[PDB]
């Protein structure tokens, strides 16, 4: 759109930092991506059940992906999923990418 690109990801970051601060989401396990997409991170989250604490983030992630994963290997906790994603987006933010 007509808004600066940095601001999108900027918001995503601040939310995760904010969310990582009830810890988190009854611990429901999700498949990791241990790059690739924002979609991979999306389709592993929208599997969570009644954890509305992570709702906004899901919507945020769905904006990085245009309109059932690909290599189901491990399955960590949500908090550990988020904590791990957070510092990766930080890297891209320092790198000034997308």
């Amino acid at each position: 759109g007509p808004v600066p690109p940095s601001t999108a990801l900027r918001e995503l970051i601040e939310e995760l930092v904010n969310i990582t601060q009830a810890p988190l989401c009854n611990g429901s396990m999700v498949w990791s991506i241990n790059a690739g997409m924002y979609c991979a991170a999306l389709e592993s989250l929208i599997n969570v059940s009644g954890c509305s604490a992570i709702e906004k983030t899901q919507r945020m992630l769905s904006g990085f992906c245009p309109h059932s994963l690909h290599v189901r290997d491990t399955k960590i906790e949500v908090a550990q999923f988020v904590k791990d994603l957070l510092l990766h987006l930080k890297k891209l933010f320092r790198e000034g990418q997308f």
């Binding site: 759109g1 007509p2 999108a8 918001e11 995503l12 769905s62 904006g63 990085f64």
Partner: protein
């Protein structure tokens, strides 16, 4: 009655709770009776909502689409209901048309060194994204001579401004209002706060 939309519905978002959509029909109307505004978050797992529009000029109307919160990606299906008949199907991205809430609780206080201190309140809670990204504009002008004006630019975090009274007439009375915008979203300015005089 050829019911028609003479002006395509425009919309802006406070990026908090309320959005504002305005449109103009091709003739006088009672929207509280005739028009309905159905909007749905295209985060599909999500329910459509009805909006009861209010008259906005006897031939124009406005509705307020209530919301829990909003994020950049968020997008909405908009449909304008009469009756059953058409028309408007529309998409809306609150992120694209941010219209920040107006700042408030503006006062003036007398400090040492014959300096003046103006203060106001950030219209958002610390949790809200805009909270840290609001740069203000203070507008001080004389009523006597509206030509004798002054405009300041506030880019810091503390919603405050201190100036030297030596910049006033020492004589006349002044009115002053502030407004805000987020440079991070390239938004239109807010509404001017309730002007003060001292």
């Amino acid at each position: 009655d050829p019911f028609k939309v003479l002006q395509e519905p425009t919309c802006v978002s406070d990026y908090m709770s309320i959005s504002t959509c305005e449109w103009k029909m091709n003739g006088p109307t009672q929207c509280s009776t005739e028009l309905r505004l159905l909007y749905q978050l295209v985060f599909l797992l999500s329910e459509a909502h009805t909006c009861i529009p209010e008259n906005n000029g006897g031939a124009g109307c406005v509705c307020h689409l209530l919301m829990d919160d909003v994020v950049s990606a968020d997008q909405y299906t908009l449909d304008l209901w009469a009756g059953q008949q058409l028309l408007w199907k529309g998409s809306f991205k609150p992120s694209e048309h941010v219209k920040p809430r107006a700042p408030g609780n503006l006062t003036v206080h007398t400090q040492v060194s014959d300096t003046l201190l103006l203060t106001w309140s950030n219209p958002y809670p610390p949790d809200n994204y805009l909270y840290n990204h609001l740069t203000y504009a203070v507008n001080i002008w004389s009523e006597n001579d509206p030509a004798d004006f002054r405009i300041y630019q506030v880019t810091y975090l503390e919603p405050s401004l201190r100036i030297a009274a030596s910049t006033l007439k020492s004589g006349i009375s002044y009115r002053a209002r502030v407004r805000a915008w987020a440079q991070c979203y390239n938004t239109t300015w807010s509404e001017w706060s309730p002007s003060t005089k001292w």
